[PDB]
Amino acid sequence: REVISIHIGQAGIQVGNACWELYCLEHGIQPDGQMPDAFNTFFSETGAGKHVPRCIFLDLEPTVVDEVRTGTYRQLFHPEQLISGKEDAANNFARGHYTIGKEIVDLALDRIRKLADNCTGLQGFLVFNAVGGGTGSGLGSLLLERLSVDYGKKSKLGFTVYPSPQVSTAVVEPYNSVLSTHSLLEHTDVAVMLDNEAIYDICRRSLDIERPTYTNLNRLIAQVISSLTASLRFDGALNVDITEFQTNLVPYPRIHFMLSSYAPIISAEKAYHEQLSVAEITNAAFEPASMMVKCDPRHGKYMACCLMYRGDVVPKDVNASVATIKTKRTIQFVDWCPTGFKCGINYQPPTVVPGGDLAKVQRAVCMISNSTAIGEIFSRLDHKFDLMYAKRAFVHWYVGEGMEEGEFSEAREDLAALEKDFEEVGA
């Protein structure tokens, strides 16, 4: 069983930079590339005493790819997989999907094609990108499109970075977010989104780090990703594979958007403070104080849930805990889904990174759920989309590239149609 991970755009590669770091520290792999079987899903053995990841960083600016090439992981990340362009698309879906995509996407596809040929038992793909930018949105969707026409039936886990409502670093990012989701509707089978303010709130409140850098951000994200790939990497008492998220978490072919959360995010002294057990983290994985997406699930109704347990955990108390939640009435389910949980248990506990601010726990919980909470977030995004669309803002840049208004109006009508589906699924 194997899965490869590709990183589109700037954001995805710092996610990967912390992600593969966590992986080699988990499998005991020095940054030169060698240890002093579980690596099979991520690492292929070149010759003898060497391991290369089934991964590609790919960007349009060369400076941050060169950072990876000349950082500490020069020998780990092998010098040809790290694809780099020449000029950035500069926060433009059209320049990232049509202008330079026609030169980069072919090189990327036949690169991963031979990566797949090196692979044997590929479970699926997983992508790390931000839809608010231009590089992650444009060619990222182009890749996704060409992956769908290449394989299609294989799973594509999209761990994208959705923008926060109030805090934002770009201006055309709602254009880029809508224009990426429009294709992500029918390209991603399973699309998991990560707001950043929610991660800010988590490190502010729980981790109590008054100065959070994007490194800590990505450390937590990688902690999420490792907690969901631990079932593949290590055997547990009850394992889950990548193919299950289509059947368990997606009720409708266009409603594939998942709330992600982690618990317990606990500082070093607070682990000394609190006695961690199953019930409180089972509760902790449900308040908006621990979500990676800024939304209030009390306003929403959960469609389905997924709960990954890592470490010292037995199934008895997690079944007792989910029983208490199901008999609680502060969090409500939809009437079309009586059994709304997908749980799993892995034996190995999550590890720590030196320099990180996390302490090791006896057990941790990773929650990925679907709700109508996203049914509200997409309307909040479509509203701010229409405020600047009403006066034709920043559309002449798309027309100067060669785009028109037709797909803008179609994306507007499709996202409106997804909203009616969100209401129809809420009732």
Binding site: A268, E269, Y272, A359
Partner: peptide, 11 residues
């Protein structure tokens, strides 16, 4: 405890 000692060394 080792983590706390590392905190003290960092401070």
């Amino acid at each position: 405890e080792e983590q706390m000692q590392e905190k003290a060394e960092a401070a």
